[PDB]
Design a protein around this ligand. Sequence first.
Ligand SMILES: O=C(O)C(=O)NCc1ccc(F)cc1F
Length: 181
Amino acid sequence: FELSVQDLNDLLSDGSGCYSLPSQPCNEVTPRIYVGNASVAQDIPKLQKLGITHVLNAAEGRSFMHVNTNANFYKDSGITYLGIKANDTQEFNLSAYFERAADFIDQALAQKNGRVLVHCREGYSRSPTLVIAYLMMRQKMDVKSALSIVRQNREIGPNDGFLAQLCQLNDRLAKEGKLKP
Ligand SMILES: O=C(O)C(=O)NCc1ccc(F)cc1F
């Protein structure tokens, strides 16, 4: 999938081939789904104002490359938490979590007042990958349309390994007849 990954890179970059970082801490990328950074995840007052009911930490961990939070952190607010201990590297198999994350997003949106924040450290690689996978798996969007819609609403940049994982997901869903044209 080296070309399909390059094709996805061309959709992320500007036309000069360069990659921009997020211009804001948090964005609603599709209705009731937000992608953001560590600071928004750790600002409970901000979360309550946005009306976030569910937080999916896609970078849970203890290092400087992780966000060191847990369900306890959110007990007082009544926010429902899910953590995934992922690393932002080309070899980390985030695809093993796609079903779990999609189920959690579905759980959040199944309540009419539900709003989910999917976040990582910068809201740039780990978290957008999960949202894109969700859109493909649960809203029948092909990878190009899903990545494009997220990228229109937030500067994102999944690493090439994550992008290769999304391409393999796309091939499987296509063949199973689960993608809209
Ligand atoms: O998966 C993530 O958390 C993620 O967003 N990684 C990108 C990133 C992390 C740290 C940094 F200083 C600059 C970055 F662009």
